């Protein structure tokens, strides 16, 4: 009953949100085998190597390293001799901070010293330790790439064994390095691509939403497996998966969609439904611009229609407030006695509000020399978007609609 739902909710939330390690690996057998073999070579012997892993963000770059480390550290007492250092390009943005983090992680601050002294020969002269470098591309943007060059030098030296691992999303990481470090860099690269077909993606989805064998209740787990297997071949679920697979093959988006689907699981509906997946996909695939347009007012709609008319008459040219005001006046003057008797300040405030929502952006920004009036403004919307949004507008009057059609 309720306890089983709470437990399965906790387990799946841990699986998706925190991305807890799992024994299941997809299409990465050769890459993981190579990486584990080289890690074992670097650990059981004094040899040093340098490897870079390239892949799109959200493709489980960290998972391969974590699984390999969990597999190989606990082999023998080598982990006692093995030391690991983790560096992220976001937290450590300066070489001083990187050096401080390296010293603190090694518990050598007592040996090296506590003060802010810039000397690093305490470690350099003394220098198996493994290095993990998250966002390796950021380190290449430092002033002189001193840390990377020193790491490559000590890797190429015959003093101590050092393993260097870097993570990069850019495919041009080879040209972001200087000639010296590129020459001293051992050209070991591993590429993480989603090289699998749609049926394999369906298998991945079926396995991911499958309860583990360690769940207490076994008959409920078997019924859940039957439900997910039955939901696997449903053509609506397949259509949603096909759409999301056409959009992107990254597993992070699939995890997000599965998490959002599981949110609508209550006591009255212990097992999911294809309509739940349809609702989740619909919620995940809405455009923000149309939503913003829907929440506007009548005056803003009229101003936007005038803006579209300006863009149509003057092909791809900027504009200001005065022309828009003049042609809005033209529109309200052609009509005999429509209730739109508004003064200048309210229209000016409406234009300011529209500019605040960042639907209109200035060109070659300057202030003081040019007022808000007589300022070159441009629209950031498409005509078809305006037509579609106006079609779904709840209470659009006939007059403004016909003006828009004109």
């Amino acid at each position: 009953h309720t306890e089983c739902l709470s437990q399965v909710q906790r387990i799946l939330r841990e699986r998706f949100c925190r991305q807890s390690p799992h024994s299941n690996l997809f299409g990465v057998q050769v890459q993981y085998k190579h990486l584990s073999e080289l890690l074992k070579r670097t650990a059981l012997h004094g040899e040093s190597n340098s490897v870079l892993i390239i892949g799109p963000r959200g493709s489980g770059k960290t998972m391969l390293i974590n699984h390999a480390l969990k597999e190989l550290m606990e082999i023998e007492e080598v982990s006692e001799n093995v030391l690991q250092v983790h560096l992220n390009g976001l937290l450590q943005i300066n070489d001083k901070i990187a050096l401080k983090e390296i010293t603190r992680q090694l518990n050598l601050e007592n040996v090296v010293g506590d003060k802010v002294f810039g000397s690093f020969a305490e470690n350099l002269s003394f220098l198996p330790v493994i290095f993990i470098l998250d966002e390796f591309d950021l380190f290449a943007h430092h002033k002189n790439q001193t840390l990377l060059y020193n790491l490559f030098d000590i890797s190429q030296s015959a003093q101590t064994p050092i393993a260097v691992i870097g993570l990069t999303c850019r495919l041009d990481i080879l040209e972001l390095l200087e000639k010296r470090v590129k020459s001293r860099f051992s050209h070991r690269q591993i590429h993480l691509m989603n090289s699998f077909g749609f049926p394999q993606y369906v298998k991945i989805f079926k396995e991911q939403l499958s309860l583990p064998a360690e769940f207490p209740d076994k008959v409920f787990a078997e019924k859940w497996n039957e439900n997910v297997q039955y939901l696997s071949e449903d053509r609506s679920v397949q259509e949603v998966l096909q759409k999301h697979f056409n959009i992107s093959k990254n597993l992070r988006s699939l995890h997000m969609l599965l998490m959002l689907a599981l949110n609508r699981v209550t006591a009255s509906h212990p097992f999911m439904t294809a309509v739940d997946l349809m609702e989740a996909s619909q919620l995940c695939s809405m455009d923000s611009k149309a939503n913003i347009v829907h929440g506007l007012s009548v005056l803003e709609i009229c101003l936007i229609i005038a803006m579209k008319h300006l863009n149509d008459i003057y092909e791809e040219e900027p504009f200001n407030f005065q022309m828009v005001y003049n042609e809005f006046q033209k529109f309200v003057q052609r009509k005999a006695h429509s209730v739109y008797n508004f003064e200048k300040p309210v229209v000016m405030k409406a234009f300011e509000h529209l500019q605040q929502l960042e639907l209109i952006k200035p060109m070659e920004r300057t202030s003081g020399n040019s007022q808000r009036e007589y300022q070159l403004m441009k629209l950031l919307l498409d005509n078809t978007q305006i037509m579609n949004a106006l079609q779904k507008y709840p209470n659009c009057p006939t007059d403004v609609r016909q003006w828009a059609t004109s």
């Binding site: 001193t146 190429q156 015959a158 695939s285 952006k361």
Partner: protein, 364 residues
């Protein structure tokens, strides 16, 4: 195992004792430094060469030979100091490094420079001849050029007893980077190390694998020839040999796989493994470029071309947000060029790879 022995011999850090492939340059340096050590007079030499020519190894071997000669009481005793330019956090800190290497005193950059100046300009106690090695000279540059001027002017003093060897990669440095008076100071003492010929590379490889029959001559000849035709560098040659050994653990095929895996670009296969929508986006970009002829295009026209292509292909109508997300993903892996942080519909797009490569990848 034989493969394990070959891997051990072929490692980069396994420096050989002495290879006559550079024996002529060794002999020239051996005459120069010996002359500077016998006369109790300083000197300076500038050596320029592409990386992988063994400049650092040759200098260290010459220093080893000089130290051995001193140990055999044939040369007056000397003090050796080595500094690396790129291993220093600040340029002015090199003054502290040399001082701490010679006396162990800690002082500020300016005070260390002043103390070194006092030691090298005043007639002090008779000290051993100082052998100073500076690595990566070009990285010591300063807008005032005071450090370089001092480094290449101090041995000119008779009392200095300082011999300085400057290792760099650019031979133009003393002309377009160094001013006239110091350019004439390093003038006519420029050693250029030419890259190894394929015969030299084969000789080096044979010396690495003496008394070991692990590789066929054909693989060795082809690897040396590729190295000659590409860079003439021993480091990548050793990497290729190690990778060939690794693949053989799993002939000329191993060397070919190593060379075309560690040198060739992965853009083609990355495009091949791209999604269908990304392929349609690339085709729309190519069609728009052919229609216009320009190498820059706004996001709106590309979106219109993509919509037209999707309508032709029967694909469902794509939203603007979906196309923007695909473009952002493509720009993340440096296949395109875009600044989508603030501009959305007015984004300039430039191809990061040649058009013919895209055509050859997309035809299949």
């Amino acid at each position: 195992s034989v493969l394990e022995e070959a891997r051990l011999r072929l490692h980069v850090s396994a420096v050989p004792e002495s290879l006559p492939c550079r024996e002529q340059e060794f002999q020239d340096i051996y005459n120069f430094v010996e002359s500077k050590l016998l006369d109790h007079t300083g000197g300076c030499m500038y050596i320029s060469g592409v990386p992988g020519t063994g400049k650092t190894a040759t200098v260290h071997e010459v220093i080893r030979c000089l130290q051995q000669a001193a140990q055999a009481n044939d040369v007056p005793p000397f003090q050796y100091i080595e500094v690396n330019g790129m291993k220093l956090t600040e340029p002015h800190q090199v003054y502290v490094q040399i001082l701490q290497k010679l006396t162990g005193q800690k002082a500020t950059a300016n005070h260390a420079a002043e103390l070194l100046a006092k030691q090298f300009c005043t007639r002090g106690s008779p000290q051993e001849t100082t052998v100073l090695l500076v690595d990566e000279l070009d990285l010591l540059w300063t807008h005032k050029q005071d450090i370089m001027y001092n480094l290449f002017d101090w041995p000119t003093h008779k009392e200095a007893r300082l011999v300085v060897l400057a290792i760099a990669n650019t031979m133009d440095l003393p002309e377009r980077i160094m001013m006239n008076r110091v350019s004439s100071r390093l003038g006519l003492t420029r050693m250029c190390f030419q890259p190894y010929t394929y015969s030299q590379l084969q000789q080096i490889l044979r010396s690495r694998l003496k008394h070991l029959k692990a590789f066929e001559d054909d693989a060795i000849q082809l690897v040396a020839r590729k190295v000659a035709a590409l860079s003439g560098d021993a480091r990548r040659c050793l990497d290729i040999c190690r990778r060939a050994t690794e693949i053989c653990e799993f002939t000329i095929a191993h060397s070919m796989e190593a060379v075309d895996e560690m040198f060739s670009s992965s853009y083609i296969t990355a495009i091949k493994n791209s999604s269908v929508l990304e392929q349609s986006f690339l085709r729309a970009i190519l069609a728009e470029f052919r229609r216009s002829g320009l190498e820059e295009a706004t996001f709106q026209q590309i979106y219109s071309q993509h919509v037209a292509l999707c309508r032709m292909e029967g694909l469902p109508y794509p939203t603007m947000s979906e196309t923007m997300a695909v473009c952002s993903h493509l720009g993340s892996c440096r296949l395109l060029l875009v600044e989508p942080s603030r501009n959305d519909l007015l984004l300039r797009v430039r191809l990061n790879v040649s058009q013919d490569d895209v055509l050859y990848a997309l035809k299949d």
